[PDB]
Amino acid sequence: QTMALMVSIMWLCTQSMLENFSAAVPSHRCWAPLLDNSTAQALSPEALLAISIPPGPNQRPHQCRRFRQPQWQLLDPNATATSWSEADTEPCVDGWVYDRSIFTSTIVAKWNLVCDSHALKPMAQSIYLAGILVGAAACGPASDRFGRRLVLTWSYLQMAVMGTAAAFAPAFPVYCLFRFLLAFAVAGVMMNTGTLLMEWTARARPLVMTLNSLGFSFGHGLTAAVAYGVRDWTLLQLVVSVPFFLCFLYSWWLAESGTLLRMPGLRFRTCISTLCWFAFGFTFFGLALDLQALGSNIFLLQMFIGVVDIPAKMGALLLLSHLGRRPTLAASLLLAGLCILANTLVPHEMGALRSALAVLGLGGVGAAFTCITIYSSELFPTVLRTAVGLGQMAARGGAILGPLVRLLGVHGPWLPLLVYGTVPVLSGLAALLLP
Ligand SMILES: CCc1oc2ccccc2c1C(=O)c1cc(Br)c(O)c(Br)c1
């Protein structure tokens, strides 16, 4: 049934976006004796925070430096500001405390994902996407040998097990391995859903693909409210993996009640298709995992993303049927690129405009994904149509490389978004040459 597969891809998108909320980094600072000890620290907690922690980024108290002695010279207005020396600080060693207002517990607050180990969260996302790549490359022969339903049930079981395991991970490497296996199973079930829907009904192939993409959009929408409802990442992952344990009941239908010629042949077509797929994967998995910086409220941002992406990808099929394949794809790619570039061009104070631009960029990259998926079945003849597999492999690779470019935020907060906006422009300019 198409409804069961739609619920499945909805929960898959929920699991995929769970990393955006569970790895959210709140405003943090390390343990200070004048702020977290007994009442002997005294009134005016802001003054104590100012004299105990030097200023840092965005004119805020430094999230990575603490004063060993109370610097009373910065409290008195008669003294010169920023008069403290660098030697008066310590490398934020006493352990960090986090604000429990928005999120009660996250993977950043649990394992102390801080400035010294700030690369761990993008490294965690990269490990997840590498597990996705490995699973998608491995489930092919497995599904061909053991059948699609067997590997589907095995992937569901693995998804459930790894979800309930990562919900209680005691260490960071163990959590990374659990996410790796969960991504393996996610890629397996994704490849199974794709190879099932591409030949279950099909003339109706574009309709089925648009329904699949609308099901993830619905997944985005659902996971927004799911993350808004529960504040703990453990219970979040538990209640997200429980539907997979429920869908496992359909195992065995209730108990019975090669192709390397793509590189030399059509080289221009295959490199263009792989470039567009790489661009979509890179931009999506680099932008959809850091919604905290793209908007002011992550939940409302995701809700707007979904409610604007639904009609965009709905009319995407009308555009593909009326205007063509290449022109609408190039237009969507250019629109997404220009929106993401304007997101950096607009000042950070215009939060509503930044959120709208991010939503428009996500809708544009989703429409571009729809167009490239439709064009993969037409750019290559039936003799070469593992072109779609190579395109999907290039898209993961781009997804994997996505979070790795986010490390450039040290040189500037706009560089990752600058790349996320510049890549789709060149992608559309290259796709404009398609026949
Ligand atoms: C069916 C695949 C799919 O369709 C979507 C529609 C909206 C948002 C995400 C997705 C989505 C993915 O999550 C996805 C999965 C893999 Br594997 C990829 O290599 C890339 Br790139 C993207």
Q: DSSP secondary structure string, 303-347?
A: HHHHHHHHHHHHHHHHHHHHT-SHHHHHHHHHHHHHHHHHHHHS-
Helix H or strand E encompassing 188: helix 172-197
CA of 144: how far to CAs of 40, 111, 140, 183, 309, in Å? 69, 40, 6, 20, 34
* Residue nearest to ligand 1 atom 10, measured at CA: 216
Residue nearest to atom 2 of ligand 1 (CA): 190
The token duo for 39 is 């009442």
Q: What's the number of CA atoms in the CB half-sphere (13 Å) around residue 149?
A: 8
110-113 contacts: CB < 8 A, separation 24 or more? 111/171, 111/172, 111/175, 113/23, 113/25
The atom of ligand 1 lying closest to the CA of 366 is 7
CB atoms within 10 A of CB 337: 26
Ligand 1 near 133 CB (within 6 A): no
Name the residue of 126, 193, 195, 213 whose CB sits within 8 Å of the most ligand 1 atoms, as the mutation to test its pocket. 213
Rg of the Cα atoms in the chain: 24
CA of 302 to the centre of ligand 1 (A): 16
**Residue 182 pairs with which residues in a beta bridge?**
none
Length of the chain: 435
Measured CA to CA, the distance from residue 371 to residue 359 in angstroms comes to 18
- How far apart CA 182 and CA 160 sit, in angstroms, is 8
Kindly state the helix (H) or strand (E) to which residue 399 belongs, with its residue range: helix 387-405
CA–CA dist 424, 276 (Å, integer): 8
Candidates 343, 346, 398, 22; CA nearest to 182 is 22
Q: Do domains 114-257 and 262-435 have the same CATH topology?
A: yes
Nearest CA to ligand 1 atom 19: 396
Look at residues 16, 102, 10 and name the one whose alpha carbon lies nearest to residue 292: 102
In terms of C-beta density within 10 A (0-12 exposed, 13-18 middle, 19 or more buried), how is residue 215 classed?
A: buried
Q: What is the CATH code for 262-435?
A: 1.20.1250.20
User: Is any ligand 1 atom within 6 A of the Cβ of residue 165?
Assistant: no
Instruction: Write out the CATH class of domain 114-257.
Output: mainly alpha
Find out whether the beta carbon of 218 lies less than 6 Å from any atom of ligand 1. no
Sign of CA pseudo-dihedral 35, 38, 41, 45 = positive
Domain boundaries, the chain: 28-98, 114-257, 262-435
Kindly give the number of the ligand 1 atom that is closest to the alpha carbon of 187.
17
Euclidean distance between CA atoms 405 and 335, whole angstroms: 22
What ligand 1 atom has the least distance to the C-alpha of 9? 1
Residue owning the nearest CA to atom 13 of ligand 1: 13
Q: Is 185 in the pocket of ligand 1 (CB under 6 A)?
A: no
For residue 107, give both structure tokens: 């993977």
CA–centroid distance, residue 402 to ligand 1 (Å): 14
Ligand 1 contacts CB of residue 344 (under 6 A): no
Structure tokens at 236: 């979040």
Query: What residue's CA is closest to ligand 1, atom 22?
Result: 281
Nearest CA to 287 among 178, 180, 381, 417?
Answer: 417
Cβ of 158 less than 6 Å from ligand 1: no
Using CA of residue 303, residue 307, residue 312, residue 314, what is the dihedral sign? positive
Q: Determine whether the shortest distance from the Cβ of 135 to ligand 1 is under 6 A.
A: no
Asked if residue 190 has its Cβ within 6 Å of ligand 1, the reply is yes
Name the CA dihedral angle for 60, 64, 69, 71, rounded to a multiple of 10 degrees: -20
How close is the Cα of 112 to the center of ligand 1, in Å? 30
Q: How far is the CA of 67 from the centre of ligand 1 (A)?
A: 46
Cα–Cα distances (Å) from 153 to 134, 177, 216, 265, 423, in that order, read: 18, 21, 20, 37, 38
Q: Ligand 1 centre from 78 Cα, in Å?
A: 58
Ligand 1 proximity of 310 Cβ (cutoff 6 Å): no
d(C-alpha 120, C-alpha 348), whole Å: 26
Residue 252 near residue 151, CB atoms below 8 Å: no
Task: Using the mean position of ligand 1's atoms as its centre, give its distance from the Cα of residue 12 in Å.
Answer: 9
How was this structure obtained?
cryo-EM
Write the residue with the smallest CA distance to atom 8 of ligand 1. 216
CB 405 within 8 A of CB 416: yes
Residues sharing a CB contact under 8 Å with residue 329, sequence separation 6 or more, in sequence order = 276, 368, 371, 372, 375, 428, 431
Atom of ligand 1 nearest to the CA of 285: 21
187 Cβ closer than 6 Å to some ligand 1 atom:
yes
CA angle 41, 44, 48 (to 5 degrees): 55
Residue 165 exposure: Cα atoms within 13 Å on the Cβ side:
18
Residue 128 CA to residue 399 CA, distance in Å, equals: 10
d(CA 251, CA 245): 11
